Write a protein that binds this DNA or RNA. Structure first.
Ligand code: MG
Ligand code: MG
Ligand code: MG
Ligand code: MG
Ligand code: MG
Ligand code: MG
Ligand code: MG
Ligand code: MG
Ligand code: MG
Lengths: 202, 159, 293, 176
RNA sequence: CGGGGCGGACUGUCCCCAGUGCGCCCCGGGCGGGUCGCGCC
RNA sequence: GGAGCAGAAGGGCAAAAGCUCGCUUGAUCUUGAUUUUCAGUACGAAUACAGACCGUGAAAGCGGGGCCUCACGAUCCUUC
RNA sequence: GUCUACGGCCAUACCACCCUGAACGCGCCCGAUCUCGUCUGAUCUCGGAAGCUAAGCAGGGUCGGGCCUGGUUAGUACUUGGAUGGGAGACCGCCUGGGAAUACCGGGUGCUGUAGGCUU
């Protein structure tokens, strides 16, 4: 059926996405990239924990779906159903080829898609409250068991799935430089229209 | 493998720069070119007449012939193991002058005026140029304050 | 809040503006490229074009050649400088274009010193004339015609100015097809109605027709003819005296007026500290207003 | 008084084009008679308008002749517009006014006003589109030094309705 | 970090309002570069 | 310009090179030079000129085929 | 201090909205006898001068959007040359030189040629 992943572990073939030129590609196994309670606002889930690669290699969509499933199951039976939100941060855009079951006319045909990950690159992220940190770490370790390379579990210095740090977060919210909307936040720079400042700051 | 078409591989070099399309500016047409001067060959792609080959794009030659809209240029091209002077007819939207030779001519005139003033005033002055000498021993004032102590930072993993 | 906006951030990010005089609507760079640029094996010969522009109240005739820093006007005539002899009213019409072109030609070649030869046609008949270069004497001035965005049809005042310059003595290549005497259906040039258009006899006929038909609409149309009392008679002779005065003394001279003050008629551009203080006190006044509540 | 009597020289809604149109899905003598009613109604020779693409549903193919239209401006335009509003009894109801300050309507039968019926000529309806302007709108279609007309010189729906009911004492916004 | 007399424009504290830049010269304070500089080490 | 420019794709193009009219046959007759593949041979294709005769336009100009990159063929023999 | 005509560079010049405009000018504007064009003197062409800055245009404004230019990002990413360096590999560190680009934060917002006007 599917070859062992060690045949396609390494990035050596010059990114190959599905386009005009690459037609007839099957669907990747990972279809859901976000999971859990995706509507908690910004401050329901302040703690973010990433699982980040430390190797230059490509991971298969099958491995991504397996890790997403097992991390989701541990988070569900540990932190409750609506106690977390996870996003995988890696989409399988690179198409891998297979040659048919001599070497004449040997250019293969699309059999799958993988995601190429770099050395410093987040593979998965979970945001949760500040008291489930060990549960996030355990879920990410048990999901780390589904990949070929070497991965590290790291708690971010930033508030949830944002790009602003947890110490300067509430101060920016209070001085209204950072307005919450949805899962994330908008940054308000002090160079727009003053009428925008007036419909804000009031 | 590949074709021997005349514009093979010229997807980007014969294109226009970003937000630079449309009408060709008229100063490029109203430059003058006397036979003997040094011109750069670039070859824009808005004009399709008289355009140079991709081997001559980005090159530099001298004018040997002037016609109504074009110029005959003598360019050095490197065929496999020899350099030979090719004679190409290229249009004035595709060429422009050479500031290198311009700079050389103005330092020639500066040298001539300097030698004239030295001869009339009775001195000896330097005319050549010298390649960036070493660095002439000097004192560095601390202005009373002590130099700041630098120190490598600890390792923290952000990204 | 339903339709996708078109002039958005990416629209202005990759918008490329046209040339300044194109997006002001004054220069056709197609015709400009074909008309200004000299052959490269001439190397420095200026290429002269006679710009003719008819505004709402004035006719401008210039003679220029292009340099890299911008064009160079050599001579310029004006319908507003026409009334210092002969005519006083009835500018920006075909007869005014003829005398303007004549004045520009005579001014240019008496600047160049070739007035004692190249007399053109000292009497006006609206027929085909082209100057020729007398051997041993300097060659005739060669100019082309810059009509700009003016739609060239039969009976355009740009061709009035062309006929004026050619009778003045310039050599401008042309044909009599776009002259008001030209008949389209017979491909024939009459030249007597062209002479009438040069003398302004069509406006005189309009004046006579309006007088015998009416009084109040006639003076409402030609109000500034009643002032200076330009009857439909003495219109052609008047233009003949205008032509004679141009041939007599075509040199331009201006007047000095230098006793002027330095008053600002615009507003100065505001400064950075002014703008910062403006937005500061605007915020302060807003917060003060919302605490008055 | 003093602040109101300044713009009255050059800021007055006047009637630009009347935009008369008849569109019928067939060609031939029906279009010739549809042009003949236009000639006898306006005094101008009208202009034919072609299909742009075959649709085959009700059935027209491209490059045919489908419509006859005419453009009328001035005193003739205002008096023909007067006749059309006499037919509409100076009532056009809510939303015929476009957001650019133009409007129009349709007439189902032309003989009512004006010209007497001719037995050869048919029974054709038509539609009126008045596009309305202001002195200085010709800079948008001037050839030399073209410009756009400027923001507060435009015609809005509100001032179009205000001008209509002030110049024809008509009625907008009926019982619905 | 600034003080005196003349010129515009801003603010929802506008008669009793406030604050900003620019033009004239008078000074006030501190910093640097050239000066037979001038001495002293 | 997200349209179109005969077709593959790329480039180019807006009072254009697109669309609609008007007039035409520079898709004609000639010698040489050059570029492209290149051995710096040929063909093919192309680019600057020059000499005629013309077309168009008020004119400057533009035009010796197709906006550019492809669309084609020695000796010998036959035919005009 | 500005404007017309023709421009050069071609957004610091564009776009959106708001305010001001003395004098010349540029326009809007009035008309269709002639020239010439239209279904339509709306456009184009012609003949004017009663009114007008409403509009175009110009200048200014906006914690404006774009654009231009700096800082930061960052000596980061990438990279020339070197090693009997490390590591099972994947890749990584060092030596010798070069060295970016977003996000984010400032400042700016048309210069100028020739000819001819107005501004006491
Ligand atoms: Mg490979
Ligand atoms: Mg190949
Ligand atoms: Mg190939
Ligand atoms: Mg060609
Ligand atoms: Mg033209
Ligand atoms: Mg010719
Ligand atoms: Mg020839
Ligand atoms: Mg901005
Ligand atoms: Mg280094």
């Amino acid at each position: 059926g599917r070859r062992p992943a060690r045949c396609y572990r390494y990035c050596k073939n010059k990114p190959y996405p599905k386009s005009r030129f690459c037609r007839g590609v099957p669907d990747a196994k990972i279809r859901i990239f976000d999971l859990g309670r995706k509507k908690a606002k910004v401050d329901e889930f302040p703690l973010g924990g990433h699982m980040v690669s430390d190797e230059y290699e490509q991971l298969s969509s099958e491995a991504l779906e397996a890790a997403r499933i097992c991390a989701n199951k541990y988070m569900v039976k540990s932190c409750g159903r609506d106690g977390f939100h996870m996003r995988v941060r890696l989409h399988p855009f690179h198409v891998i080829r297979i040659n048919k079951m001599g070497m004449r006319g040997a250019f293969g045909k699309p059999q799958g898609t993988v995601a190429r990950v770099h050395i410093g690159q987040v593979i998965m992220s979970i945001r949760t409250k500040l008291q489930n940190e060990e549960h996030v770490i355990e879920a990410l370790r048990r999901a780390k068991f589904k990949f070929p390379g070497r991965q590290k579990i790291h708690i971010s210095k930033k508030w949830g799935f944002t790009k602003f740090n947890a110490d300067e977060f509430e101060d920016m919210v209070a001085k209204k430089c950072l307005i919450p909307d949805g899962c994330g936040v908008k940054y308000v720079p002090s160079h727009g229209p003053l009428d925008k400042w007036r419909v804000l700051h009031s | 493998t590949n074709t021997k078409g005349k514009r093979r591989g010229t997807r980007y070099m014969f294109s226009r720069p970003f937000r630079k399309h449309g009408v060709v500016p008229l100063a490029t047409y109203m430059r003058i070119y006397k036979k003997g001067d040094i011109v750069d060959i670039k070859g824009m792609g808005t004009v399709q007449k008289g355009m140079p080959h991709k081997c001559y794009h980005g090159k530099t030659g001298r004018v040997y012939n002037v016609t109504q809209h074009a110029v005959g240029i003598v360019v050095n091209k490197q065929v496999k193991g020899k350099i030979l002077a090719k004679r190409i007819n290229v249009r004035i939207e595709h060429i422009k002058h050479s500031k290198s030779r311009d700079s050389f001519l103005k330092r020639v005139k500066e040298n001539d005026q300097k030698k004239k003033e030295a001869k009339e005033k009775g001195t000896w002055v330097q005319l050549k140029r010298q390649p960036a000498p070493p660095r002439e021993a000097h004192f560095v004032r601390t202005n009373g304050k002590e130099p700041e102590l630098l120190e490598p930072i600890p390792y923290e993993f952000m990204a | 809040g339903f339709v996708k906006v078109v002039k958005n951030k990416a629209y202005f990010k990759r918008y490329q503006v046209k040339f300044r005089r194109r997006r002001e609507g004054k220069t056709d760079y197609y015709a400009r490229k074909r008309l200004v640029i000299q052959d490269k094996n001439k190397y420095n010969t200026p290429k002269y074009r006679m710009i003719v522009r008819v505004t709402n109240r004035d006719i401008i005739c210039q003679i220029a050649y292009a340099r890299i820093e911008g064009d160079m006007i050599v001579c310029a005539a004006y319908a507003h400088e026409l009334p210092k002899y002969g005519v006083k009213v009835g500018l920006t019409n075909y007869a005014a274009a003829y005398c303007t072109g004549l004045l520009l030609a005579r001014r240019l070649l008496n600047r160049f010193g070739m007035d004692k030869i190249y007399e053109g046609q000292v009497e006006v008949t609206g027929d085909e004339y082209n100057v020729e270069s007398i051997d041993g004497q300097p060659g005739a001035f060669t100019c082309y015609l810059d009509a700009g965005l003016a739609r060239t049809t039969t009976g355009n005042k740009v061709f009035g100015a062309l006929k004026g310059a050619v009778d003045g003595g310039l050599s401008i290549p042309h044909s009599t097809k776009r002259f008001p005497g030209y008949d389209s259906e017979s491909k024939e040039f009459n030249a007597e109605v062209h002479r009438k258009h040069i003398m302004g006899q069509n406006v005189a006929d309009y004046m006579r027709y309006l007088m015998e038909e009416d009084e109040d609409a006639y003076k409402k149309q030609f109000s500034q003819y009643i002032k200076n009392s330009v009857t439909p008679d003495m219109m052609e002779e008047m233009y003949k005296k205008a032509h004679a005065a141009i041939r007599e003394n075509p040199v331009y001279e201006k007047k000095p007026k230098k006793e002027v003050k330095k008053k600002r008629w615009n507003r100065p551009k505001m400064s950075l500290a002014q703008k910062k203080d403006r937005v500061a006190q605007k915020k302060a006044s807003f917060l003060r207003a919302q605490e008055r509540a | 008084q003093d602040q109101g009597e300044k713009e009255n020289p050059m800021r007055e809604l006047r009637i630009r084009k009347l935009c008369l149109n008849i569109c019928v899905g067939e060609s031939g003598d029906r279009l010739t008679r549809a042009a003949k009613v236009l000639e006898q109604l306006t005094g101008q020779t009208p202009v034919f308008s072609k299909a742009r693409y075959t649709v085959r549903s009700f059935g027209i193919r491209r490059n045919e002749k489908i419509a006859v239209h005419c453009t009328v401006r001035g005193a003739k335009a205002e008096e023909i517009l007067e006749k059309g509003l006499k037919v509409r009894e100076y009532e056009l109801r809510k939303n015929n006014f476009s957001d650019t300050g133009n409007f129009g309507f349709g007439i189902q039968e032309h003989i009512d006003l004006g010209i007497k019926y001719d037995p050869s000529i048919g029974i054709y309806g038509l539609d009126f589109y008045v596009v309305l302007g202001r002195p200085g709108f010709s800079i948008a279609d001037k050839k030399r030094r073209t410009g756009c007309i400027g923001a507060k010189h435009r015609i809005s729906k509100e001032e179009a309705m205000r001008w209509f009911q002030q110049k024809y004492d008509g009625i907008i916004l009926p019982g619905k």
